[PDB]
Amino acid sequence: MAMKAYSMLNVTATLDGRRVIGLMDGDDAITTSPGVDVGTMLVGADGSWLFSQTADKSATVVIKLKPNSPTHRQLTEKWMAQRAGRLVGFPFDFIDSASNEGGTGAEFFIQKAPDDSKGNNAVVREWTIVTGEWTPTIPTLL
Amino acid sequence: MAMKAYSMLNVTATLDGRRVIGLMDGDDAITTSPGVDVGTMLVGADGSWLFSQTADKSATVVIKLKPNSPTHRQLTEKWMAQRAGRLVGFPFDFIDSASNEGGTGAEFFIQKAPDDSKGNNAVVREWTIVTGEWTPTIPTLL
Amino acid sequence: MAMKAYSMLNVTATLDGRRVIGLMDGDDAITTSPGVDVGTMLVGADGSWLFSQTADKSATVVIKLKPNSPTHRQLTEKWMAQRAGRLVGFPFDFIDSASNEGGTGAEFFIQKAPDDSKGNNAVVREWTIVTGEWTPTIPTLL
Amino acid sequence: MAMKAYSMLNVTATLDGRRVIGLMDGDDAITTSPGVDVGTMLVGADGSWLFSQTADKSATVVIKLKPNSPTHRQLTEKWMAQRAGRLVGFPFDFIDSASNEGGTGAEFFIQKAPDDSKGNNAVVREWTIVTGEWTPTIPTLL
Amino acid sequence: MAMKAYSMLNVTATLDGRRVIGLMDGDDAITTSPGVDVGTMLVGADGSWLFSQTADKSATVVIKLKPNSPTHRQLTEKWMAQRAGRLVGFPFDFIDSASNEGGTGAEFFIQKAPDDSKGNNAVVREWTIVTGEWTPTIPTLL
Amino acid sequence: KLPYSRVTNVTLTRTDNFPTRRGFGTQLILTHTAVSGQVDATKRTKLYASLAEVEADYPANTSVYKAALSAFSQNPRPIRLKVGYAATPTGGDDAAKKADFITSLGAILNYDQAFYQITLDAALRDQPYLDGLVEWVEAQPKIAMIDSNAAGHEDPANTTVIAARHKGTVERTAVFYHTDSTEYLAASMAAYMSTRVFDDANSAYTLKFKKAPGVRAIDKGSAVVTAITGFVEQTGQSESAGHCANTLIDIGDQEFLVEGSTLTQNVFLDEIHATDWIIARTEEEMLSLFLNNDRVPFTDQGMQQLASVPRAIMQLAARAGIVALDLNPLTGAYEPAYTITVPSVFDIPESQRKARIAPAIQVRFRYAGAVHYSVINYTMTF
Amino acid sequence: RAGIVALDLNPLTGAYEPAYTITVPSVFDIPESQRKARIAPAIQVRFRYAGAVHYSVINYTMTF
Amino acid sequence: AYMSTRVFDDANSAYTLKFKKAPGVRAIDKGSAVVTAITGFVEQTGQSESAGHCANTLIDIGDQ
């Protein structure tokens, strides 16, 4: 079970059951960030201290797409479904087969919609989705 | 029905019935952005969560023009009509024939007016318009 | 009536009856900007909307000059007249003969005074003037 | 209709109605080059791609002349007319009768002026002209 | 099946179904180059390393022609078709029969257009075309 | 004054309209009915444009209208059905004899070659003379499909039914077994199959195995759905333990086609459809090569010019997902997905050179399949 | 540029077709018997017109 | 008066129609089935020579 070097050919992302396909160029095409800081240190006037840990386990992910990708059509249909008043979960999941690093979330929602720029060359379309519960997977292959 | 590569020769924008013609150089000549975020995640002190979706479907579009373009004359007449006290809608619409991506709005208004700079070389004239209802069209050709 | 290409040889600016002559280098030597936004969109908690238009038609213009120009002397005399307590209008006007784009204002006032820097090479002197009523002219030659 | 071998005796260039006569020595006496690249390929992080085509059809031509040629006098009069403030088109056209290769442009402008070097032997005078619309002719004789 | 020595008499290139005929002199008349590097090595502050492989399989080819060749006429017609707004693929393919080395691409586009130089002797006309997918053929005859 | 219809024309109807979405193919509907105004010995076949414009065939006849009804009833729609005149005589003057039916089949090509999928509907069902179609579509670049309205395929032992007397020997025919009064071949084929465009990336519908038609009804049972479709749970599909067909089961609240339209033990419909797209595309590109060039010479340069066509078609096909990804399926080691070998005219004698028939070019394949059945284990430890 | 001449595409199929051509004759084989006329030979030019729209149609199917 | 002040030296200055243009001040004629005997214009087919006589009448449809 040799440790495969990194490659985007071996990363898979699944949005509502379908694959994510037409991604923009760059080192940051799918990025997930936790919602808050894990904890806070409180130091008093005497030198004693107290740590406090949060119970909030939430995250956002940002997906950068090309103007010609089926995932853009899927996300723009989901946006219109939300605008109509139909509010459901739509899971998102992605992982790397080389290291088993990734995470899952069983209920996501659209948070930001992209800007439609036409101009002279084609440009990015950035979507943002948010969940209330994100559990990272343990990389068991280091 | 081959998927046409991108080209500004196949994008059409219609403002109050007339075409938009003299556009500045760059990758961002007509850009539309939604007014607000689609939703908000609220996580409590215990780890539970709640999502909330907005009912606001509004957008602005920014149009960058050259100092010699008939659309600049049309927009400066619309600005003076608004300053006189006559307040009506004037639809705006634009679409891409290669993918059927775009959107429409039946009632727009002037929001920002450009700066008249003379200088040594010619420079941009940027207009901003706003609507209370913007519906994106579904790209059925992906 | 051929549409003349742009040239600073065909732009004329008149300040209190006299021409503006010694201008600095750059693409922004005389720039006029409106005082406020034209309007504001207000969207409610239910999705309905309301636009509001302002009655304020005011502007500033910024003039960048060389340290050796008669307009600098004229503006520094106007500044001292204002400091003495004599407060009158002094019209400003400028237009482009190629497109008939420009504007006029019948009563201006000094708002900012430049900085006198000596140094090793000569540098800009920037003046700012303000009016309560600015009417753009319609470019009838597009 | 035999395919004539190449010869500068069978190339004709017309500038504002008159012929171009006294040309310098070399393989590059009249050269026209397009303003920009025809298009751009955009490849994403996943391997998908998108092409984009420009709408800019502009070109420059460089003409190298001897210090004793009537075309030098014609171009130096056109330069002074532009410096006075008179800005008009002046078509340029050239073609090869052996293959029907060439192009035309109905409105050109002076862009660069030559350097007047005296020295011990006579040297080149290089002019540059620019248009916003250049249409190549199809070589129908191959 | 003797290994034939190299010869341009046994190389065939097909552009949109037709042969490529009038080529300039030199050792580089048709050259194809990959768009990017195959991969990247990343070495950390401790001595450990990580390789990353790209998913971009694109290439350009440069074709150098004489001013009297039917392929020049074909390419200048394709350029005008692209400038009109018609954007399609036009395959390109070339191979060597002595070694079975070459490659194919099912959809190309014009990227650069040549310069029309007249001068005293005839000179090169260089075209550039680009694809988003280029697959080299395996030389099975070594 | 004047109406607005002086300068424009705005109408309104009460009907359902879906986008067109052109695709690959066309189907054929052969029966014995004739309409006398559009097939009367002048057109062994006749084309159309849309269903609504049907007038020649009565909107109540079971054969044509009730079959075009399910042919044109997919959410995206195909176009130009190929309407029937073909075997207007009843099977044969001697009914039990299949020679007349075979000759009838052999005399309907001579008018038209634009159909790819052959469907008999609402009649001719369960006739013994139909064996000619099964024997004949072999070595014939088409697809033969027969939907019964009723038979005894539900016995995993009997040998008299269509799918029994021809099972494991034919690789280009399939059965749409069902209950009475529903036209089924038209429901999915040529209505979902037709609007499949393989010119896009990742457009390989390798299954055709869970797909919903426009409107229809399910059959019934659980242990009867394995006598038909011959599908065992996790092993696969066994020839002895069932008869292959398609029945449109329902499992949850959804109804969908099942078995993915097999033909023999483990041969599926999308394989045939996709490879036939490959062949028909190479034909079109070859013809487009003969029309652009002045000539194609009979030299080695001409052979390479000809062989340039399969090279582009294979790159087109590997992108759709039909051709495999360059790796050995057994071990995962590197292996070429496809090769193209061009022959030499050199040692082909001039005795044969004067033929103006080029030597054959040979191409190599590897298919990329898909998944029909999944397994999950779920060990629990407390 | 004004929009009078068409945009370089076949109106039937949308394939590429030149909008206009200009063919220049030869004085070479025109005899000197005719050369002394001081009347130049004729130049031939080719066209294609670009029309516009007078009448529109919209269908509006309703499904409820 | 409108035809004269048409400058074709600018981009996109093709008034290909001359088909819906307002004069300074004037009056309309009357009718609906009389506007097709004159101008010979059928609804969606086009303009037929046998079914009318071509001319120009300055109709009014809306308030224009």
Separation CA C112–CA C127 (nearest Å):
6
D65 sits in the region (left: phi over 0; alpha: psi -120 to 50; else beta) called beta
Separation CA F223–CA F155 (nearest Å):
11
Chain G and chain C touch, per 3+ beta carbon pairs within 8 A: no
Q: Which residues of F174-195 are buried (b: 16+ CB within 10 A; e: fewer)?
A: bbbbbeeebbbbbbbbbbbbbb
Report chain F residues whose CB lies below 8 A from the CB of G61.
12-17
H or E stretch including D73?
A: helix D70-84
Separation CA A23–CA D43 (nearest Å):
9
Nearest CA in chain H to G5: H14
Separation CA C6–CA B119 (nearest Å):
10
**F78 residue type, one letter:** P
Separation CA D30–CA D35 (nearest Å):
16
CB contacts < 8 Å between E and G, how many?
19
Report chain F residues whose CB lies below 8 A from the CB of E12.
301, 304-305
Contact between F11 and G56 using a beta-carbon 8 Å cutoff: no
Separation CA H40–CA C128 (nearest Å):
66
Angle between helices F300-320 and F269-292 (to 10 degrees): 140
Burial label for B18, CB within 10 Å (0-12, 13-18, 19+), is exposed
Asked if D134 is an interface residue toward chain E (Cβ–Cβ < 8 A), one would say no
Closest CA to A94 of A32, A140, A141: A32
Beta bridge partners of B103: B94, B136
Contact between G3 and H14 using a beta-carbon 8 Å cutoff: yes
Chains contacting H (3 or more CB pairs within 8 Å): F, G
Give the one of H20, H43, H60 whose C-beta lies nearest to F1's C-beta. H60
Cα angle B121, B124, B130 (rounded to 5 degrees) comes to: 170
**Cα G22 vs. chain centroid, distance in angstroms?**
10
Report chain B residues whose CB lies below 8 A from the CB of E85.
7, 9-10
CA–CA min distance B127, chain D (Å): 22
Separation CA F54–CA F71 (nearest Å):
13
Q: What are phi and psi of E80, to 5 degrees?
A: -70, -35
Cβ neighbours of residue E65 under 8 Å, at least 6 residues apart? E22, E23, E24, E71, E72, E75, E114, E124, E125, E126, E127
Separation CA F284–CA F312 (nearest Å):
12
Chains contacting A (3 or more CB pairs within 8 Å): B, D, E
Contact between C37 and B112 using a beta-carbon 8 Å cutoff: yes
Report chain C residues whose CB lies below 8 A from the CB of B76.
136, 138-139
Closest CA to F196 of F185, F184, F207: F207
Structure tokens at E111: 């990227």
3-state secondary structure labels for all residues of chain B = CCCCCEEHHHEEEEECCEECCCECCCCCCEEEEECCCCEEEEECCCCCEEEEECCCCCEEEEEEECCCCHHHHHHHHHHHHHHHCCCCCCCEEEEECCCCEEEEECCEEEEECCCEECCCCCCCEEEEEEECCCEEECCCCC
CB F229 within 8 A of CB F153: no
Separation CA D78–CA B23 (nearest Å):
30
Separation CA D95–CA D101 (nearest Å):
6
Please give the C-alpha separations between residue H30 and each of B90, E64, F70, G54, H34, in angstroms, as whole numbers.
33, 70, 53, 22, 8
Contact between B5 and E109 using a beta-carbon 8 Å cutoff: yes
Structure tokens at F2: 């004047």
Cβ neighbours of residue F99 under 8 Å, at least 6 residues apart? F92
* Interfacial D residues in 121-140 facing G (CB < 8 Å): 133, 137-138, 140
**B66 residue type, one letter:** K
Local structure of F70: helix, strand or coil? helix
Separation CA F201–CA D44 (nearest Å):
15
Asked if A123 is an interface residue toward chain D (Cβ–Cβ < 8 A), one would say no
Residue with tokens 């009649």: F123
Please give the C-alpha separations between residue H20 and each of F169, F314, G9, H29, in angstroms, as whole numbers.
72, 55, 28, 15
Report chain F residues whose CB lies below 8 A from the CB of E16.
292
Chain E and chain F touch, per 3+ beta carbon pairs within 8 A: yes
Structure tokens at F369: 């399949």
* Interfacial D residues in 12-31 facing E (CB < 8 Å): 25-31
Q: Which long-range contacts (CB under 8 A, 24 or more apart) does G13-18 make?
A: G14/E86, G15/E86, G16/E77, G16/E78, G16/E80, G16/E81, G16/E84, G16/E86, G18/D138, G18/E80, G18/G46
Q: What are phi and psi of F287, to 5 degrees?
A: -65, -40
Please give the C-alpha separations between residue H51 and each of B54, F351, G53, H31, in angstroms, as whole numbers.
60, 70, 22, 17
| Length of chain C measured in residues | 142
Q: Which among C1, C41, C124 is the top mutation candidate for probing chain B, defined by the most B β-carbons within 10 Å of its own β-carbon?
A: C41
**Cα G10 vs. chain centroid, distance in angstroms?**
11
B120 sits in the region (left: phi over 0; alpha: psi -120 to 50; else beta) called alpha
Structure tokens at F164: 């029994």
Contact between A22 and D46 using a beta-carbon 8 Å cutoff: yes
CA atoms within 13 A on the CB side of G20: 15
Helices (H) and strands (E) in chain F, counts: 8, 9
Local structure of A50: helix, strand or coil? strand
Give the one of H8, H19, H44 whose C-beta lies nearest to G2's C-beta. H8
CA–CA min distance C136, chain D (Å): 25
Local structure of E104: helix, strand or coil? strand
CA–CA min distance G33, chain F (Å): 41
CB F129 within 8 A of CB F119: no
Separation CA F247–CA F226 (nearest Å):
11
F23 sits in the region (left: phi over 0; alpha: psi -120 to 50; else beta) called beta
Local structure of C71: helix, strand or coil? helix
Determination technique for this entry: cryo-EM
Structure tokens at A102: 């990734």
**Bridge pairing between strands E116-117 and D30-34:** antiparallel
Asked if E14 is an interface residue toward chain F (Cβ–Cβ < 8 A), one would say yes
Asked if E74 is an interface residue toward chain D (Cβ–Cβ < 8 A), one would say no
Give the one of A5, A8, A9 whose C-beta lies nearest to E50's C-beta. A5
Resolution (Å) of this entry = 3.0
Beta bridge partners of E43: E49
Contact between A111 and B142 using a beta-carbon 8 Å cutoff: no
Q: Which among G22, G27, G46 is the top mutation candidate for probing chain D, defined by the most D β-carbons within 10 Å of its own β-carbon?
A: G22
Cβ neighbours of residue G28 under 8 Å, at least 6 residues apart? none
Report chain A residues whose CB lies below 8 A from the CB of D54.
120
Asked if F3 is an interface residue toward chain H (Cβ–Cβ < 8 A), one would say yes
Please give the C-alpha separations between residue F276 and each of D102, E93, F25, in angstroms, as whole numbers.
48, 24, 10
H or E stretch including A117?
A: strand A116-117
Structure tokens at D81: 């007319």
Report chain E residues whose CB lies below 8 A from the CB of A7.
52-53, 55
Neighbours of B73 (CB within 10 A): 18
Separation CA A14–CA A21 (nearest Å):
10
CB B105 within 8 A of CB B14: no
Closest CA to F373 of F236, F205, F223, F254: F236
Separation CA F310–CA F340 (nearest Å):
8
CB B32 within 8 A of CB B39: no
Nearest CA in chain A to E52: A6
Neighbours of G22 (CB within 10 A): 12
H or E stretch including A33?
A: strand A30-34
DSSP, residue by residue, C113-126: ------SSS---EE
CB F358 within 8 A of CB F298: yes
| Length of chain G measured in residues | 64
Structure tokens at H57: 């009448």
Contact between B6 and D50 using a beta-carbon 8 Å cutoff: yes
Structure tokens at F67: 């079959």
Beta bridge partners of B40: B52
B109 sits in the region (left: phi over 0; alpha: psi -120 to 50; else beta) called beta
